[PDB]
Design a protein around this ligand. Sequence first.
Ligand code: ZN
Ligand code: ZN
Ligand code: ZN
Ligand code: ZN
Ligand code: ZN
Ligand code: ZN
Ligand code: ZN
Ligand code: ZN
Lengths: 298, 309
Amino acid sequence: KFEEGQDVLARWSDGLFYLGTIKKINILKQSCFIIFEDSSKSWVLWKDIQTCTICQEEYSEAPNEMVICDKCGQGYHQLCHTPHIDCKWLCRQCVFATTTKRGGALKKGPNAKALQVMKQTLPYSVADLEWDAGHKTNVQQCYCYCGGPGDWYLKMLQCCKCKQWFHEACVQCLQKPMLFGDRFYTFICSVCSSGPEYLKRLPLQWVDIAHLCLYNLSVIHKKKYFDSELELMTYINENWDRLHPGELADTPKSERYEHVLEALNDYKTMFMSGKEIKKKKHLFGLRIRVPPVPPNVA
Amino acid sequence: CKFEEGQDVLARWSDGLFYLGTIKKINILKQSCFIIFEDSSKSWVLWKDIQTGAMVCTICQEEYSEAPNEMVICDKCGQGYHQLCHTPHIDCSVIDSDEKWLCRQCVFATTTKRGGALKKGPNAKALQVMKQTLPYSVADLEWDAGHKTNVQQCYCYCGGPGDWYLKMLQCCKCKQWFHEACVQCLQKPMLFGDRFYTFICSVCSSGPEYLKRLPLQWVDIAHLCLYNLSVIHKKKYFDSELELMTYINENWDRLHPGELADTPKSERYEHVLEALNDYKTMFMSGKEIKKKKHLFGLRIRVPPVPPNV
DNA sequence: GGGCGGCCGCCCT
DNA sequence: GGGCGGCCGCCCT
Ligand SMILES: [Zn+2]
Ligand SMILES: [Zn+2]
Ligand SMILES: [Zn+2]
Ligand SMILES: [Zn+2]
Ligand SMILES: [Zn+2]
Ligand SMILES: [Zn+2]
Ligand SMILES: [Zn+2]
Ligand SMILES: [Zn+2]
């Protein structure tokens, strides 16, 4: 049970836990209205609120022995933990806490290896998920290896096998920091791989680069129109390596703006010029703030 | 805005079809126009369903043209479109041919038709291609609780108005409703409120539509036909033999019930009459209100519930 | 931060 | 010498 005014750890839609205080409780919207340290406020599902630890029973069996984590010091039966403990040990939510982080989870060290193992087993059933038509969201708001909430159009990767979406912070295969709504990847999660993830960058067209970066600027700054040269092209150049342009990567910095501007002008159904609202014609924005769709998907 | 009173326009009705009409009133707040049609009938039509009319690109109103984004002229309405301005994009293959090209507007106009859109022909082939791309955003749609109506009144491949219970199919995937006139998978004209189908639209299938007829029980046959009679004639009670059974026999082929289809005409009334008397929850005899016993009506004027596949 | 009242100034046959 | 492409920037749907 929870109670108003209680200090808790709440998992956000980026897979990470944040310290907060329960202000309100909704009995079965199944959420708590939580204020965070930056005085930001939001509703959080109970499955994402953190107060045997899985069985509430004291008996240490054999070979179902009670194992105590060596960091948080909480106990787990060998067959109650997810995954099960056979044979220094850390539990799942301590493994995730010390490994998952913005930009991508840790790749090296004992904790990172413990994550790689435990990631292969989901804390939920794939059958109990109810997806929308485009397989972007599910009713349970249950995604990734962690089982937390998530927004597909932000920094998440969809597995091309199980079609589940996975947080940037929870994957360990990223060479560069993820861009918002970047779907130009072939990704296979650790569950489907039964081991380390597979990640391959799909080739980008100039219209893809323009769309993806305009989308990122739009998300970051919460605005629509951007100067094609001084804002958009600047962001593209500053993130050129992060973009993995593929075979377009050798394009001289002087020649990049030509192709980008051409894409902005040609694709009228995708990009709005400032001239349409009596502003600078070099100002461009997305008609609909939606991530670019790679050739394969929808 | 674009419109003024006395202007002759093409107005899209809730069947997905355009009709010739004249604007009598304009409502800025409702974004609609009061339109009189050729049958002198009058109704309010949303601006999104009004077609003004009947070398510059009609979409962006610019006149530049160069490969691989050239200006393509519609071989019917004569209007020009950039390859990347049209929805969907015009493939460069089109320009590399002697064959005609119609725009999305003209493609729909020449193919969509009462009882079901054209199945064969170059135009029919173009419809099945173009309608895989919606002219609207599904995310902008604000649906009601039962997912029957949205406040935008935007449905189907066409983006026009519609009544789900009046000749429309719901896709089992995207849950959007599609006009009878806009689909190319029907074998027979639809009955009102007939949801005994498994339908997958071209948008979800990325190709031809999928359609399978779900089986009807005798209670479903009576319910569906009672519902149709109630909607058409705007009343509740009908004569089981002279009115209901007459409708059922006249629409027996169009009903396509499945395993019960081979039932002899003379035998059908036996099972229909029993269904009316057995399903007390759905069917209401006239005796319950001190009227003739063989009069029957639906307690709730709603379509029958289709079975899970 | 973008919708629109406002008008600069190029350049029109 | 005036019509319109172009967009500044005021100020709050
Ligand atoms: Zn995660
Ligand atoms: Zn236990
Ligand atoms: Zn622990
Ligand atoms: Zn997977
Ligand atoms: Zn339609
Ligand atoms: Zn155009
Ligand atoms: Zn046309
Ligand atoms: Zn569909």
